[PDB]
Amino acid sequence: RLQVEGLSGQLEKNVRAQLSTIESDEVTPDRRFRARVDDAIREGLKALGYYQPTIEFDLVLIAKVTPGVPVLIGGTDVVLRGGARTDKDYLKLLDTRPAIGTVLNQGDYENFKKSLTSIALRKGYFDSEFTKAQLGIALGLHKAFWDIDYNSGERYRFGHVTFEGSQIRDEYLQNLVPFKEGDEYESKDLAELNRRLSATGWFNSVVVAPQFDKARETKVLPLTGVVSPRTENTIETGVGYSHHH
């Protein structure tokens, strides 16, 4: 069993997380082992801005860790190109960046990149790409600098929805589609299309597949909705009996 001394809060939690990965109570080393522990502690600390800790062990095994000098945010440079430049959700995201002079948290940078992609997926920026995405650490300055250059491209629009397998005439299905052809894509519209088809009770199964290989030149996304007619599921005990004797 191993116990960490010298950390207060999120540092301490992240480091305990990192440590609760390797085995403890067992038959194990003393120097090769505590050099795995040493590595794991340093990994946790780096993620939270501490690249130059001091760590010292004892005897259960207790590790005296002093975080040391932090790396501070020196800049959070992000360029947005394509629709994202003027897109209200991407602009809101820029305002979440950490302030200059705060202690580096690497997770902020990674979560920011993931948020760029998450918005792109929800709003149909399917040509989304990074031409730059670096976290640069100048340890001699104890400063960290983001460098993201992100191009969302254009928002895709919905195309025509083709239905297959239906017992229902097409004009009645089309009436259920919750967008017009030519509307900008939103992921929630696929959920609503599912919900509307579902609410009719017409089908046993519905599979709605965006046809993306039809969309890269046009930025218009057709959908194909393959359905199966609902069949009656009741307890068959109407049929009478032969003579019992």
From Swiss-Prot:
Task: Provide the transmembrane region boundaries.
Answer: 232-242
Residue ranges of the POTRA domain?
Answer: 154-230
- Cellular compartment(s): Cell outer membrane
The GO biological-process annotations, alphabetized, read as: protein localization to outer membrane; protein secretion
| Side of membrane Periplasmic, spans | 1-231
Tell me the segments the record calls region POTRA3.
138-217
Quaternary structure and interacting proteins, as annotated: Interacts with TamB to form the translocation and assembly module (TAM).
| Task performed by this protein | Component of the translocation and assembly module (TAM), which facilitates the insertion and assembly of specific beta-barrel proteins into the outer membrane. Promotes the assembly and secretion across the outer membrane of a subset of autotransporters, such as Ag43. Involved in the assembly of the outer membrane usher protein FimD. In vitro, when TAM is reconstituted into preformed liposomes, it can promote the assembly of several outer membrane proteins, including OmpA, EspP, Ag43 and FadL.
Protein name, UniProt field: Translocation and assembly module subunit TamA
Q: Which organism is it from?
A: Escherichia coli (strain K12)
Q: Which gene encodes it?
A: tamA
Q: Which residues of the full protein are shown?
A: 25 to 275 of 577
